[PDB]
């Protein structure tokens, strides 16, 4: 059983592109090869890490379940969850964002140190995706996150990396000079993944508990 992604790539579908989610809803498939990676495949420009490896892991998935790993209206009381929208990810003429990611911003002039962990209790491999914002100028960095020494740390038993977003003025792609780089890992049943940051974190919203056999 295939997946039939249509005009959408794997990166767009798994991230929750507003133009993609309108046609996909399966559980037990076997084929996924529909559209290769495009520089316009994600609604916000950026690099998708280990893309070809993710294509192999999602091959012949026997069980698929999308679940809210971090509730939007309950996980980030000291941050704004409503302003993370952008014209590059427009839906029906209004600025939107990824259906599975959450762009956190400052609240009341502060971006407090956030620390959010999640214990895998689904008895399946949980695919967790997130992003890191690389702004186009220091003004945007100060406006959205206040701090200029921003770090994002993501630690689990299989994954451990400290990201330091760099301010880079890049060629205009999809009306964006900045970028969000996308990362992912496979959380083991019973393992804990910890997200810590003081800015630039595109936090996970929905994750995927899957099985390939």
């Amino acid at each position, epitope marked *: 059983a295939p997946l039939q992604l249509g005009n959408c790539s794997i990166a767009g579908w798994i991230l929750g592109n507003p133009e993609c989610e309108s046609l996909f809803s399966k559980e037990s498939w076997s084929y996924i090869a529909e559209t290769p990676n495009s520089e316009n495949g994600t609604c916000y420009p950026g690099y998708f890490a280990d893309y070809e490896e993710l294509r192999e892991q999602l091959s012949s998935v026997s069980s698929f379940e999308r679940f809210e790993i971090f509730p939007k209206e309950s996980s980030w009381p000291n941050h704004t969850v409503t*302003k*993370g*929208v*952008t*014209a590059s990810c427009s839906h029906n003429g209004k*600025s939107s964002f990824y259906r599975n990611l959450l*762009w956190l*911003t400052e609240k*009341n*002039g*502060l971006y407090p140190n956030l620390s959010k962990s999640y214990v895998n209790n689904k008895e399946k491999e949980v695919l967790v995706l997130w992003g890191v914002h690389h702004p*186009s*100028n*220091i*003004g*945007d960095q*100060r*406006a*959205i996150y*206040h701090t200029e020494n921003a770090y994002v740390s993501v630690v689990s038993s299989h994954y451990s990396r400290r990201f330091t977003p760099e301010i880079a003025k890049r060629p205009k792609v999809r*009306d964006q000079e900045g970028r969000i780089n996308y990362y992912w890992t496979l959380l083991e049943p019973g393992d804990t993944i910890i997200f810590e940051a003081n800015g630039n974190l595109i936090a996970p919203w929905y994750a995927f508990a899957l099985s390939r056999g």
Partner: antibody, heavy 126, light 109 residues
Framework: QVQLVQSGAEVKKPGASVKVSCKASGYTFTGYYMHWVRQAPGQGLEWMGWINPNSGGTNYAQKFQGWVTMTRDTSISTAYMELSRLRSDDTAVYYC???????????????????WGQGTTVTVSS | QSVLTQPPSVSVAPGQTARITCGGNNIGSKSVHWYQQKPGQAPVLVVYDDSDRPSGIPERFSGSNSGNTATLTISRVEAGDEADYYCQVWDSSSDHVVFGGGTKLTVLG
């Protein structure tokens, strides 16, 4: 009733310093940026910079950096503006304004000014 | 700091429609705010977020923002509308708040 009330008019000799005050009421002082704008007689508005009352952080305009210092007293909800080494061109009205307009997207994450103070006239003459 | 270009003066007969433009680089992708300043008084916000009005401002004041020009429209101008009008946008590339040069609206009564 959001209101900003500034200190009275001042006269100063060239080379002196003056500290203008801007009292805020009707909202939480630390929840919004406080801007400062200068207008010379018959001239346009000139942005001088803003201060974050919550953290104390500042962002000065290039033209006013150096001889201009912004502070705030959270206990009394009052954001200060000190001018250094005044000259005759500094004769102007000085307003404070609150960044109460909420941004809608990260594409333009900027709190626009809504409520202005009445203005403080500073006259510099020898 | 990126520049905002306003016409210095605009004249209009009473009851007609006054239009004040604010030109800027890619201003259509930013939320323009307009301020009204009468002689001897502090500025007053009349239009925010391109085309929205605060409570107390009559519906005669309107706004638009597309491309490289933002427009502040005043329909059925009255004598009391004589003031200086300023646009304001934030320039992310400099982290500077920028004011337009200011437009003096004279109603020819």
């Amino acid at each position: 009733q959001v209101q900003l009330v500034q200190s009275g008019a001042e006269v100063k000799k060239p080379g002196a310093s003056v500290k203008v005050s801007c009292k805020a009421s009707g909202y939480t002082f630390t929840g919004y940026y406080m801007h400062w704008v200068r207008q010379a007689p018959g001239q346009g508005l000139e942005w001088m910079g803003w201060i974050n009352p919550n953290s104390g952080g500042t962002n000065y305009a290039q033209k006013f950096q150096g001889w201009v210092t912004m502070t705030r007293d959270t206990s009394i909800s009052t954001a200060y503006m000190e001018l250094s080494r005044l000259r005759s061109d500094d004769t102007a009205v000085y307003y404070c304004a609150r960044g109460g307009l909420e941004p809608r997207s990260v594409d333009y994450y900027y709190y626009g000014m809504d409520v202005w103070g009445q203005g403080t006239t500073v006259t510099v003459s020898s | 700091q990126s520049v905002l270009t306003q016409p210095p003066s605009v004249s209009v007969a009473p009851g007609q429609t006054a239009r004040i433009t604010c030109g800027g680089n890619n201003i259509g992708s930013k939320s323009v705010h307009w301020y009204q300043q009468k002689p001897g008084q502090a500025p007053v916000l009349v239009v925010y977020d391109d085309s929205d009005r605060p409570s107390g401002i009559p519906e005669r004041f309107s706004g638009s923002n597309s491309g490289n020009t933002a427009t502040l429209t005043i329909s059925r101008v009255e004598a009391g509308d004589e003031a200086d009008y300023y646009c304001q946008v934030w320039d992310s590339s400099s982290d500077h708040v920028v004011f337009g040069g200011g437009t003096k609206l004279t109603v020819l009564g």
